[PDB]
Amino acid sequence: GIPEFKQKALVAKVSQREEMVKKCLGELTEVCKSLGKVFGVHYFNIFNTVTLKKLAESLSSDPEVLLQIDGVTEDKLEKYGAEVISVLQKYSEWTSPAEDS
Numbered sequence: 001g002i003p004e005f006k007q008k009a010l011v012a013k014v015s016q017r018e019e020m021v022k023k024c025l026g027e028l029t030e031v032c033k034s035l036g037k038v039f040g041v042h043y044f045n046i047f048n049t050v051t052l053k054k055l056a057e058s059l060s061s062d063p064e065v066l067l068q069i070d071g072v073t074e075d076k077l078e079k080y081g082a083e084v085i086s087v088l089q090k091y092s093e094w095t096s097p098a099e100d101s
Contacts, residue, residue, distance in 0.1 A: 008098045017059065020094055024056035027087045035083050046080055047071060059095050061088030 006034040034047040041047075047055070060067060066076050066085065093099065 004093075017095070019054035020091060021059050024059055024088065024091055025052050028052055028055055028084060031087050033084050035080055039079075047076070047084070055084065055088060059088070059091040061085045063093045 006024070022051075023038070028047070029052070033058045035041075035046050036043050047069075048071040054069040055066060055070075058088050063077055063081060066072055066081060066088075067074065
């Protein structure tokens with residue numbers, strides 16, 4: 001009934017997100033490695049190249065969204081999700097407008 005338009009805090013469109021998704025690729029790398037040394041598995045064992053880019057290109061920390069990722073499964077989102085998403089939560093705040101707390 002009462003839709004919201006004109007956003008809240010306008011600022012850039014196709015520029016800040018590009019640099020945000022890239023950072024996700026790096027940050028996720030760390031968490032991934034840390035997860036391997038603990039789960040007795042290799043870095044690549046956590047997420048594949050296609051996965052790392054996915055979590056970034058989207059920049060959204062979601063369980064269902066990250067599940068549809070290439071290579072990611074219910075076991076990866078339930079085990080690593082708690083970690084990988086821990087680093088993606090930040091993007092969820094950067095992707096959406098406004099920033100209150």
